[PDB]
Ligand binder design. Sequence first.
Ligand SMILES: Cc1cn([C@H]2C[C@H](O)[C@@H](CO[P-](=O)(=O)O[C@H]3C[C@H](n4cnc5c(N)[n+](C)cnc54)O[C@@H]3CO[P-](=O)(=O)O)O2)c(=O)[nH]c1=O
Ligand SMILES: O=C(O)CCC(=O)C(=O)O
Ligand SMILES: [Fe+3]
Length: 201
Amino acid sequence: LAAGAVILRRFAFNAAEQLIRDINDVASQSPFRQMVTPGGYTMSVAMTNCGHLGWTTHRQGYLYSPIDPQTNKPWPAMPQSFHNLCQRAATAAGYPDFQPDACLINRYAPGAKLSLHQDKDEPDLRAPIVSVSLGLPAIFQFGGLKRNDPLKRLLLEHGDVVVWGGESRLFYHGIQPLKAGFHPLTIDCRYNLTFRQAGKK
Ligand SMILES: Cc1cn([C@H]2C[C@H](O)[C@@H](CO[P-](=O)(=O)O[C@H]3C[C@H](n4cnc5c(N)[n+](C)cnc54)O[C@@H]3CO[P-](=O)(=O)O)O2)c(=O)[nH]c1=O
Ligand SMILES: O=C(O)CCC(=O)C(=O)O
Ligand SMILES: [Fe+3]
């Protein structure tokens, strides 16, 4: 029950093996790292980016940068497999004009979590975010526009795609501590890809 959200279960199941290979290729150029929040805390989720712009912490805040601050080189180009999956998902959900220029890649080891937050660094909050889940299952939690709104929970499994549009694009959301387990393609972790329109164009 999330206004504006389109859940496409197992939409990415047939693409997962290529997606994971391309994650590894991206990570060999811009490695996974645990960023430090403006509050001074080290995140348990490891992240990297591909595309023209990448989400990062920097100067005690959040922003999109064309340079990876850990490598001092541009983020790797967005793989074609990523772009094609995102476009197919966005078109199926009713957002044919969506043109992402950034993809944040999250890696969750057992016990890793992501506390409640909103995604508000993008210039046009009318553009959706496309989320792709790979590997171990996670409990996704989301509330509302206010931090105190009631929480709902949704299990996200390998291959699930969610297009967060309309009101749901602005919900507070997070991930609960990942349960340990085995997945044949990721072994012991979960990956999440979130495609964003980050450029002011
Ligand atoms: C309070 C406490 C914590 N910890 C540990 C435990 C915790 O996991 C770790 C920090 O990791 P995090 O889960 O809180 O990550 C934060 C950053 C993340 N976030 C925000 N904006 C975005 C965004 N646009 N995108 C794309 C992605 N992620 C985003 O959401 C979180 C809240 O953000 P903000 O605080 O509101 O700035 O610190 C302690 O040990 N002791 C303590 O007392
Ligand atoms: O892992 C997920 O499914 C959500 C990730 C997320 O909300 C973010 O990185 O902004
Ligand atoms: Fe988020």
